[model samples]
Target: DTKLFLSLPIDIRYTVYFFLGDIILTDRLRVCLQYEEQWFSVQWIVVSGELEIGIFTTDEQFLQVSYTINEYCHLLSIAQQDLRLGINVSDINDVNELCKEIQHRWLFDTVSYISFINCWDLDHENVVSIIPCMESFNNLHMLRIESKNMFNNLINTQGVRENPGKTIVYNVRQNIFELELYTLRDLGYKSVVDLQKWEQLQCLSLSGCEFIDLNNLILPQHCKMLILKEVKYIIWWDLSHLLKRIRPQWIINGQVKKPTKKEEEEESEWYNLYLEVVQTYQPLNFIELHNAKRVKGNLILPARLVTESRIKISNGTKVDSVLLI
Candidate 1:
């Protein structure tokens, strides 16, 4: 009891729990887990089962789950230690503020893993406004989108977790910031979003989405990886601009339009199969296409730029067209 009452005992316990025991075993601990507007909360299973069942029948798709977050479980662990080592422990009023800082800056709350599940309910009338606030939890070493719908339908929409790269691991898996692009109509980005504002965006994975006008479409300048899976459509010219401007080291799927000019030019069946392979195949590494030549309708380029060509406004260097077999 004497040792337990000592200064470092509680602090050490919280630190140990952070690494070993805080596996987020319970459902309630797993999400942005709060609908402050509704005063309601629920776990992954209840809503996911509903969405799965929703696909089959129209059988009263409405749902009910009763819960409210009084306080987050892990936040207290960091806040408590922050008090002993740093913040004024006796200042009860300061506890809440420290918790805010823990998320805002990871002050003492060193928890690194987070899961977004059953957040952003479609049933909620405030549909578009329900963007996940997971971004503020900035120290995230691994951000898992474990929602039931996480598949080819990776479907975590724009602004889901905005500031991804400021402290991300930057590797393919650790930094594959995903977006499926559906919630925009709710938030007003139905057709056009100012992705230019996403300054820190690095390694973005886009799935099941469309971008019609290629010229205005802006990707983050720092992005080193661009992953596309099940995308609705993309223009080849715009994609060329992207590669020239940012030149992502890893481009997944790398889909492009079926050539309109080649069809009338009496195209080779080779081109047809190649286009099909681009679409049907899952994510193939684009890095291997470094030496690839771009065969135009009437011309092909000899120069190969896999991820190094720059878009210079001065001499007006042309964004070399996409390279393919």
Candidate 2:
């Protein structure tokens, strides 16, 4: 006799768990279906110090439902794909009424870091007004915002709007980062505020803002780290000069450069050498660079003599599928 059960495939399981707001269950399901190794246990993955929630709609609710899950809270992070919330104001009281009615259960309070992107519906007024609502999450260590619309909120937290251009007030005592702009048409508000006004911003991500004019940028002097992504047209040397002036650790990405054959050849040689070293010795002091994302080429190994004679002759028994001899 044949039997039927509720057993489902991994992909379907992931989809259901992802949408049902059961991220924890989805993660466990993933581990059961994909992971077989005993050493790299589910607990290890849960405590790996990172969590990723890819793409979400604005209507998505908080998973834990209440703020009671505090002890294991460190295994926490939140992300959304298409976050949005709508409030209509055909009547004057509509906006205020909507705020009062909100469940306010969207808790980001326990999270240390947060990011929002592709927010087309958030608009200018709602985005600025929403900050106060989020202020309840006082423990937020980082706040990252990305939007297609020009900034509209008066960023002055103290209500002193002497200068209309400066959007950041820096009162959180933690860093509040800003990015992207409305081109020259909004030059009046172009001056990115001096973040030194507040002692909190650790890292600022301004990858998609497409800021071209620096004449108005306030340029924080005390910012610890500034990350610029996808600003290809700007001269990096000039950017370097800006970095020198501020003296902040800086990183840049998405610069357009045609790789020469010589450079490509050298890179290939380096990779082969890296693999060769891995295959030669099951080195105790080395680390396995596994499951890398876009843009690879990484290694963590002990210092060794750079000579052909230094290669080890030990048997390279494969530890995992990642190794070969």
Candidate 3:
């Protein structure tokens, strides 16, 4: 067997070592080959009935070993492979091509959850290329895409297109659970609307999307957790209005104002919904909203925090308005 392996060409020799057969390192943990000088690892974590694969690589390394990667993908099947794959790339240059290759291999159909991180984007075409792959995943439950400038470029170049109004869409399956879009620039209202179609979505996170217009935003009713990070444009009124539409079970920290008795009586509908939606907290629970100011009521945390005996709040933290939860 060693002689037969050694007889192959140098590239083929390296390729043989990367076969899917070498994936599982032990009974619990699987380790992908490092390929000596290469900069990526692809391995899966073994468990009872779930599959989790991790792909760590750089653009240069991917460009070098991409052919072998295709070979590896050809050897994988959804029935046998795990249900998750995370592709972590340091360079954005060639990732689009790599994504195309993965799409061609129909690997997305095999994984339930997928992630793309640290991706670079010089043109909107590269960004658009990866979007269609979502349709191929039959069992996809969660997807995470992190980019510094890719999403921004898409929004900028979207205006000059022939259609000029093409919105980003995800043709995801019903099993899909979460979608996380972490971008450097602010996302437009159209982008938010595009996500409303995902009916099975439970958690939606728009992290690092600083400025968003939620005036017309209405998410899916099934959405339970919505995280709005670094979105300073959001105020208590916007959130109150949003809750009336989607009625998500919980929302992360935002500038929430305690309503006065007169205001509460005037806007009874929104106030009643806010009481039901805001996560309940106890005295023992750790609760403090970051950058919280002009708050009209006391801060609230989840009830579980009390059971754990953890309450976190700064003593010097000041509130400009009334403080009563």
Candidate 4:
């Protein structure tokens, strides 16, 4: 009954479209309806009846499904509503422009929560812009960005953008961002800082990145969780007292190198047993030791197990005893 209005949400406007287009342009409405209704879509399935079949085999089927993109446009056009956008990338692209286009289209305001998944290589510029846009959207509340690459761009913005502290979260999880990796590569860190502007973020995940000691790096007062995974060429004690005033969790995983035969055989035996434990249980918390000649090794823990000044040794030839460190 009412005329078209620009401010209303898509759901309501479409309802009006139903009335206007259907009554005045009945013939045109039918054609448009038919065309829109026919969605190019299909689903295929493969069944072997055997339980082992995974992604390698499947069946094929085709069907139609309705997709409405107006809501997506409206959300982006407003840029003021709480929003979530998921972008998946197999290879890295400078998608900040794409996000910006979405930003202008939806007009997202402040954020409740936003996450980016399955992306590689975040251009330092694009990534910096994204944070602000999400921050612009409802001033952003919670955000999670997971990238598989070295995250080689957490440093400060000099040319493309600057004043990163003004826009990032600085101190919740912990201040000292942690990186865990299978190898130690030159990370090329440009700047490290204390909480000045990007004030709430305190944690960094290096679940699988190379390692480099950034000059006795001291994490911001609020940092924690220096996660390392499948890594080598670094040690816990190397970064321990430099940043954390108290001992933080020094998690490491790798093979404990075996000593030569001429040395203390019992100590060597204990070290070898430690290696066995690492192999048996691939623990989340672990360390890496890198030697140019060796394949690499892990010192993993199943639980929070440790030793004191002496390694415990027991021969099953007779009896068993618990030795207190």
User: Candidate 4 on 1-325: residue-level lDDT in tens?
Assistant: 3333443455554565555432323332233334442121111111231111011100111212211235333423433323333333421223544444544665333324334444335544545455554434444334444532423244332223554643444432222233222222544333342223333343444433454443324333333333333332332222222122212122224223324556566455545545554443322232322222211122223233434311221221122212110
Query: Per-residue alpha-carbon lDDT of model 1 for 40-151, expressed as tens digits?
Result: 2222111221211011101111334322122333443323211001111121123323443543563333333333323333223111221232234334333333222332
Q: Quickly count the clashes in candidate 3.
A: 9
Model 2: per-residue lDDT, tens digit, 1-325? Answer: 1112135456664555445534443354344335331111111011122222222222222223212223223334433211222222211122422432332443332333333333434444544454444554344455434433323334323234554222433455443443222222222234443323445444444443333443333433334344433332221112222222221122123111223557765455545544554443322222221211221112122235212323232222222212111
Q: Pick the candidate with the highest lDDT.
A: 3
Q: List candidate 1 segments past 4 Å from native.
A: 1-136, 141-190, 210-213, 238-325
Candidate 1: 10-residue stretch with minimal lDDT:
51-60
Question: What is the TM-score of candidate 3?
Answer: 0.42
How close is every model to the real structure, measured as TM-score? 0.29, 0.34, 0.42, 0.32
On TM-score, who's better, 2 or 3?
Answer: 3
Q: Candidate 1's C-alpha lDDT? A: 0.30
lDDT of 3 by residue, 84-203 (tens): 444434323245446435445745445565556544543344334545545555656776666635444443333334532233453443567876666555455445334344567777
Model with the higher lDDT, candidate 1 or 3 = 3
Q: In model 4, which range of ten residues has the least summed lDDT?
A: 50-59
Q: Candidate 3, clashing residue pairs?
A: 51-82, 51-83, 92-120, 258-296, 286-310, 286-311, 286-312, 297-324, 298-324
Each model's lDDT comes to: 0.30, 0.33, 0.43, 0.34
